[PDB]
Ligand binder design. Structure first.
Ligand SMILES: C[C@@H](Nc1nc2c(cnn2C2CCCC2)c(=O)[nH]1)C(=O)N1CC[C@H](F)C1
Ligand SMILES: C[C@@H](Nc1nc2c(cnn2C2CCCC2)c(=O)[nH]1)C(=O)N1CC[C@H](F)C1
Ligand SMILES: [Mg+2]
Ligand SMILES: [Mg+2]
Ligand SMILES: [Zn+2]
Ligand SMILES: [Zn+2]
Lengths: 322, 322
């Protein structure tokens, strides 16, 4: 049953929203609500019907991978929606910037194949050869994003003038490309430097803030409730094993964190929560104090839980080895 | 024709080479000779039969556009060859670096359509949407170069280890992407920054020098003798007029420097020589003083010759005025 209850629309605004509850049509409708509710339909004369066909286009072009699937895209877009409200971003950003933040979130892993950059490059694929080993998947995601938008029936921007299309497009590209974890250190070091004296009337500081926001949402699964978050780790590792199978039986290098024999659910997250998630949301909390209690808080609770799980896993491996 | 005379082999080593005398047959055999003579076939275990097939395929993947054709390809690699000897590059650069320089120069405009990046982006071409407005032609040149090299019958790198291939791929990519003239000032400023106190054991200083070197060869046509240089100006304007005419009938922006109402042969070369070519070769001359007499001298004469021809143009216009 598409058509959402008023209870659902309420829940949808917070990062506690149970993303697993809903089937695709309900998620499409949830996303459709977001565009209306943020005033993007109103302020960019988006045809209400074109909006629905666009979300169906997008959905069709996400794949049935275990992790990089349409449900991931909904998580990231819904988490961006939560962040608009939590941080009150309509006070600091234009409606163009919100449109970029939302449309980039929805489009940022379009047609992900289930194998990451390092596979693409080492196997010398169609995509690595096409994009010269430079963020190949991330370029592919934008390419597909705008190939969808070039179809008149899927074009939510059809009544935006050329200058505004040009600005959105640039913005969307900057953000979708920023999702490549290869650049996490570079992007964070850029941001932290700008943060020494932040200025919202500085376009360059704001371009970085948006980059950090989409990144925050992209890797945001562990910010959610333990019940909601925990199943994404199986989805990740299942996808990661799929690749490291292929890498072994093709003789390509294998990343320790994708190695069946090495990684566990617990050791996948301890490091990620501690040295990627926590520091990123720590920096962002300076700019938005309310982030601490809502987002940084479940990250401490997740860190503490996954370190306990490791103590039990490790204790259990003392029984196994011969 | 093919089977090059000892005289042709000697004249091929210098910037004075009459690039117009030779049909595709002979230019290929020349390029081939360059690889044997520079010790690239020897030092990289290149199969000389594969070398011939690669070159035929490269040549096949250049288009019959007025300016950006196989002959332009030949000029850039031939000018690179000249510079190797003039600047004694084998005393400063590794054989791997020479391989990167020659192979990049040959490959740098593969499958160029005859309309520049500004066309691609304003007409929203497959290429522009594919490459996210980011140097769409240059990325595509690289893409075509390594599609070709992925075919085993065209693969001149087939006996190089993977480590070496990765290093060459990366190097060629940097160079080909450096030929986008939109980055000329950025690249020159980055080069000039290092040039304050240059260092050949600094790998980044070298990476820029190689970017400058291919840039020099890419736009070097005015360095060649005045009989050889001048018909290339007609080829250029023919291509640019072909684009400005399309831009006019398609309702797209037109660039003054490409307008067939506004631009003369002389106005097309004066600014370009005085403010792009000359300062670039001036900066190279500091590192290689011998460049002044052999390359900056013909540029000076061409500037003078074209500045005089504008004074003729301008006085003929004053008689026209009624
Ligand atoms: C085992 C892996 N753990 C991990 N990776 C994630 C999450 C979300 N997204 N991702 C990647 C990165 C973006 C796409 C999928 C997450 O909750 N945990 C890790 O530590 N790393 C660190 C390097 C790499 F980012 C994965
Ligand atoms: C009229 C044009 N003149 C010009 N352009 C050239 C030459 C060689 N290569 N090129 C371009 C560089 C990339 C494509 C071919 C040359 O001898 N003269 C100009 O003034 N400009 C201003 C900058 C723009 F690149 C061309
Ligand atoms: Mg991704
Ligand atoms: Mg070019
Ligand atoms: Zn993602
Ligand atoms: Zn060129």
């Amino acid at each position: 049953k598409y058509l959402l209850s008023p209870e659902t629309i309420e829940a949808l605004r917070k990062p506690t929203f149970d993303v697993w509850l809903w089937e695709p049509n309900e998620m499409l409708s949830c996303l459709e609500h977001m565009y209306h509710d943020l005033g993007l339909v109103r302020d960019f004369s988006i045809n209400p019907v074109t909006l629905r066909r666009w979300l169906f286009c997008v959905h069709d072009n996400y794949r049935n991978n275990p992790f990089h699937n349409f449900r991931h895209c909904f998580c990231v877009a819904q988490m961006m929606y939560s962040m608009v409200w939590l941080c009150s971003l309509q006070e600091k950003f234009s409606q163009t910037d919100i449109l970029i933040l939302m449309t980039a979130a929805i489009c940022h892993d379009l047609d992900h194949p289930g194998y990451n950059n390092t596979y693409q490059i080492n196997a010398r694929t169609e995509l690595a050869v096409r994009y010269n080993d430079i963020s190949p998947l991330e370029n592919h995601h934008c390419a597909v994003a705008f190939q969808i938008l070039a179809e008149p029936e899927c074009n939510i921007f059809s009544n935006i003038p050329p200058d505004g299309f040009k600005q959105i497009r640039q913005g969307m590209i900057t953000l979708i490309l920023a999702t490549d974890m290869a650049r996490h250190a570079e992007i964070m070091d850029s941001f932290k430097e700008k943060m020494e004296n932040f200025d919202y009337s500085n376009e360059e500081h704001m371009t970085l803030l948006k980059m950090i926001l989409i990144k925050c949402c992209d890797i945001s699964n562990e910010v959610r409730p333990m019940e909601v978050a925990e199943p994404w780790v199986d989805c990740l590792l299942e996808e990661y094993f799929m690749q490291s199978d292929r890498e072994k039986s093709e003789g390509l290098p294998v990343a320790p964190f994708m190695d069946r024999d090495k990684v566990t659910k617990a050791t996948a997250q301890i490091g990620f929560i501690k040295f990627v998630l926590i520091p990123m949301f720590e920096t962002v909390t300076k700019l938005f104090p309310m982030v601490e209690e809502i987002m940084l808080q479940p990250l401490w609770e997740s860190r503490d839980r996954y370190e306990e799980l490791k103590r039990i896993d490790d204790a259990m491996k003392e029984l196994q080895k011969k």
